[PDB]
Amino acid sequence: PVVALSQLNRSLEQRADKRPVNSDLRESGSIEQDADLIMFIYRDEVYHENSDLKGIAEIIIGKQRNGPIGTVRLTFNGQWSRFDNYAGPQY
Protein backbone atom coordinates (compact mmCIF):
# COMPACT_ATOMS: atom_id res chain seq x y z
CA PRO A 1 0.00 0.00 0.00
CA VAL A 2 1.13 3.50 -0.96
CA VAL A 3 -0.42 6.42 0.94
CA ALA A 4 0.23 9.79 -0.70
CA LEU A 5 -0.81 13.13 0.76
CA SER A 6 -2.27 15.79 -1.52
CA GLN A 7 -3.68 19.31 -1.31
CA LEU A 8 -6.94 20.99 -2.27
CA ASN A 9 -7.81 24.25 -3.99
CA ARG A 10 -8.57 27.40 -2.03
CA SER A 11 -12.09 27.69 -3.50
CA LEU A 12 -13.27 24.94 -1.13
CA GLU A 13 -13.07 27.50 1.67
CA GLN A 14 -15.69 29.66 -0.09
CA ARG A 15 -18.46 27.04 -0.19
CA ALA A 16 -21.23 26.99 2.41
CA ASP A 17 -20.18 23.48 3.45
CA LYS A 18 -16.41 22.99 3.50
CA ARG A 19 -16.34 19.19 3.68
CA PRO A 20 -14.24 18.12 0.68
CA VAL A 21 -15.68 16.43 -2.41
CA ASN A 22 -14.06 14.83 -5.44
CA SER A 23 -14.46 17.96 -7.55
CA ASP A 24 -12.34 19.76 -4.94
CA LEU A 25 -9.32 17.96 -6.42
CA ARG A 26 -9.27 20.58 -9.18
CA GLU A 27 -6.12 20.63 -11.38
CA SER A 28 -5.62 16.98 -10.32
CA GLY A 29 -8.29 15.02 -12.15
CA SER A 30 -5.78 12.27 -12.90
CA ILE A 31 -5.38 11.77 -9.14
CA GLU A 32 -9.11 11.06 -8.78
CA GLN A 33 -9.01 8.87 -11.90
CA ASP A 34 -6.05 6.74 -10.84
CA ALA A 35 -6.43 6.48 -7.06
CA ASP A 36 -7.97 3.30 -5.70
CA LEU A 37 -8.98 4.92 -2.39
CA ILE A 38 -9.55 8.58 -1.54
CA MET A 39 -10.00 9.82 2.03
CA PHE A 40 -10.57 13.42 3.10
CA ILE A 41 -9.71 14.69 6.58
CA TYR A 42 -12.19 17.19 7.99
CA ARG A 43 -12.00 18.93 11.36
CA ASP A 44 -15.02 21.10 12.15
CA GLU A 45 -13.31 23.04 14.93
CA VAL A 46 -10.80 24.44 12.43
CA TYR A 47 -13.52 26.51 10.74
CA HIS A 48 -15.97 26.91 13.66
CA GLU A 49 -14.85 28.07 17.09
CA ASN A 50 -18.22 27.11 18.63
CA SER A 51 -18.19 23.58 17.21
CA ASP A 52 -19.77 20.80 19.26
CA LEU A 53 -17.29 18.33 17.72
CA LYS A 54 -14.10 19.68 19.29
CA GLY A 55 -11.44 17.01 19.28
CA ILE A 56 -13.46 15.00 16.74
CA ALA A 57 -12.21 14.49 13.18
CA GLU A 58 -13.97 12.90 10.21
CA ILE A 59 -12.40 10.65 7.57
CA ILE A 60 -14.66 10.83 4.52
CA ILE A 61 -14.26 8.10 1.93
CA GLY A 62 -14.84 10.04 -1.28
CA LYS A 63 -14.03 7.09 -3.52
CA GLN A 64 -13.85 3.47 -2.41
CA ARG A 65 -13.17 1.17 -5.32
CA ASN A 66 -14.07 -2.16 -3.72
CA GLY A 67 -16.63 -1.25 -1.07
CA PRO A 68 -19.05 1.30 0.36
CA ILE A 69 -18.43 4.96 1.10
CA GLY A 70 -19.21 7.20 4.06
CA THR A 71 -17.78 8.98 7.08
CA VAL A 72 -15.76 7.55 9.98
CA ARG A 73 -15.43 9.57 13.18
CA LEU A 74 -12.23 9.59 15.24
CA THR A 75 -11.01 11.50 18.29
CA PHE A 76 -8.25 14.06 17.68
CA ASN A 77 -5.85 14.66 20.58
CA GLY A 78 -3.73 17.56 19.42
CA GLN A 79 -2.14 17.66 22.85
CA TRP A 80 -0.43 14.33 22.10
CA SER A 81 -0.62 14.75 18.30
CA ARG A 82 -2.66 11.56 17.90
CA PHE A 83 -5.84 10.11 16.45
CA ASP A 84 -7.82 7.56 18.46
CA ASN A 85 -10.95 5.47 18.07
CA TYR A 86 -14.11 7.47 18.73
CA ALA A 87 -15.79 6.18 21.90
CA GLY A 88 -18.89 8.37 21.63
CA PRO A 89 -22.33 7.28 20.49
CA GLN A 90 -22.52 6.05 16.90
CA TYR A 91 -25.48 6.56 14.57
Binding site: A16, D17, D44, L53, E58, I60, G70, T71, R73, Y91
Partner: protein, 113 residues
Protein backbone atom coordinates in the same frame (compact mmCIF):
# COMPACT_ATOMS: atom_id res chain seq x y z
CA UNK B 1 -47.35 21.59 14.35
CA UNK B 2 -44.89 22.36 11.57
CA UNK B 3 -41.68 24.05 12.74
CA UNK B 4 -40.88 27.61 11.72
CA UNK B 5 -38.10 28.67 9.36
CA UNK B 6 -35.45 29.00 12.07
CA UNK B 7 -36.26 25.65 13.67
CA UNK B 8 -36.30 23.98 10.25
CA UNK B 9 -32.88 25.44 9.40
CA UNK B 10 -31.49 24.30 12.76
CA UNK B 11 -32.86 20.79 12.19
CA UNK B 12 -31.38 20.73 8.67
CA UNK B 13 -27.95 21.74 9.99
CA UNK B 14 -28.16 19.15 12.79
CA UNK B 15 -29.08 16.46 10.25
CA UNK B 16 -26.19 17.53 8.03
CA UNK B 17 -23.79 17.26 10.97
CA UNK B 18 -25.13 13.93 12.30
CA UNK B 19 -26.00 12.00 9.12
CA UNK B 20 -22.39 10.90 8.59
CA UNK B 21 -22.97 7.80 10.73
CA UNK B 22 -26.55 6.70 9.94
CA UNK B 23 -26.83 4.00 7.25
CA UNK B 24 -29.44 6.01 5.32
CA UNK B 25 -31.69 9.05 5.57
CA UNK B 26 -34.75 6.97 6.50
CA UNK B 27 -32.88 5.58 9.53
CA UNK B 28 -32.69 9.07 11.07
CA UNK B 29 -35.01 9.50 14.09
CA UNK B 30 -37.45 11.83 12.33
CA UNK B 31 -40.24 13.31 14.43
CA UNK B 32 -42.71 13.06 11.53
CA UNK B 33 -42.81 12.29 7.82
CA UNK B 34 -43.20 15.97 6.87
CA UNK B 35 -40.09 16.87 8.89
CA UNK B 36 -38.13 14.13 7.11
CA UNK B 37 -39.26 15.28 3.67
CA UNK B 38 -38.57 18.97 4.33
CA UNK B 39 -35.17 18.47 5.98
CA UNK B 40 -33.98 16.03 3.32
CA UNK B 41 -35.18 18.25 0.47
CA UNK B 42 -33.42 21.29 1.94
CA UNK B 43 -30.24 19.28 2.52
CA UNK B 44 -30.18 17.98 -1.05
CA UNK B 45 -30.93 21.44 -2.46
CA UNK B 46 -28.06 22.91 -0.44
CA UNK B 47 -25.76 20.09 -1.53
CA UNK B 48 -26.60 20.51 -5.22
CA UNK B 49 -26.70 24.34 -5.24
CA UNK B 50 -24.32 25.45 -2.43
CA UNK B 51 -27.09 27.57 -0.93
CA UNK B 52 -26.10 30.09 1.72
CA UNK B 53 -27.82 30.66 5.06
CA UNK B 54 -30.27 33.26 3.73
CA UNK B 55 -31.00 31.16 0.64
CA UNK B 56 -31.52 28.12 2.86
CA UNK B 57 -33.98 30.08 5.01
CA UNK B 58 -35.85 31.28 1.91
CA UNK B 59 -36.06 27.71 0.58
CA UNK B 60 -37.27 26.50 3.98
CA UNK B 61 -39.99 29.16 4.03
CA UNK B 62 -41.07 28.24 0.49
CA UNK B 63 -41.19 24.54 1.37
CA UNK B 64 -43.21 25.29 4.51
CA UNK B 65 -45.70 27.37 2.51
CA UNK B 66 -46.00 24.61 -0.11
CA UNK B 67 -46.51 21.96 2.59
CA UNK B 68 -49.15 24.08 4.36
CA UNK B 69 -51.01 24.60 1.07
CA UNK B 70 -50.83 20.85 0.42
CA UNK B 71 -52.09 20.04 3.93
CA UNK B 72 -54.96 22.53 3.69
CA UNK B 73 -56.08 20.84 0.46
CA UNK B 74 -55.87 17.35 1.98
CA UNK B 75 -53.51 14.63 0.71
CA UNK B 76 -51.89 11.86 2.79
CA UNK B 77 -48.12 11.68 3.23
CA UNK B 78 -46.78 8.16 2.57
CA UNK B 79 -44.28 6.58 4.93
CA UNK B 80 -40.86 7.59 3.47
CA UNK B 81 -39.84 5.59 0.40
CA UNK B 82 -38.08 2.62 2.07
CA UNK B 83 -35.21 0.66 0.49
CA UNK B 84 -34.71 -3.11 0.95
CA UNK B 85 -34.83 -5.20 4.15
CA UNK B 86 -31.92 -5.72 6.55
CA UNK B 87 -31.38 -9.48 5.84
CA UNK B 88 -29.15 -11.33 8.31
CA UNK B 89 -28.99 -14.79 9.86
CA UNK B 90 -25.55 -16.15 8.93
CA UNK B 91 -24.55 -18.69 11.63
CA UNK B 92 -21.59 -20.13 9.72
CA UNK B 93 -18.39 -21.27 11.44
CA UNK B 94 -14.85 -21.51 10.10
CA UNK B 95 -14.79 -25.32 10.08
CA UNK B 96 -17.88 -25.66 7.87
CA UNK B 97 -16.60 -22.98 5.48
CA UNK B 98 -13.23 -24.73 5.18
CA UNK B 99 -14.97 -28.06 4.59
CA UNK B 100 -17.08 -26.46 1.85
CA UNK B 101 -13.98 -24.94 0.24
CA UNK B 102 -12.22 -28.32 0.30
CA UNK B 103 -15.31 -29.99 -1.18
CA UNK B 104 -15.40 -27.37 -3.95
CA UNK B 105 -11.71 -27.96 -4.68
CA UNK B 106 -12.24 -31.73 -4.83
CA UNK B 107 -15.34 -31.43 -7.02
CA UNK B 108 -13.84 -29.00 -9.55
CA UNK B 109 -10.31 -30.42 -9.28
CA UNK B 110 -8.49 -27.08 -9.35
CA UNK B 111 -4.80 -27.71 -9.99
CA UNK B 112 -3.80 -24.26 -8.76
CA UNK B 113 -5.96 -24.47 -5.64
Amino acid sequence: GLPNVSELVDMVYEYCRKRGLYPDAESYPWKSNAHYWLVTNLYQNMRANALTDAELRRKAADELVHMTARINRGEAIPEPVKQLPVMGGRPLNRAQALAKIAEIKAKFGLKGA
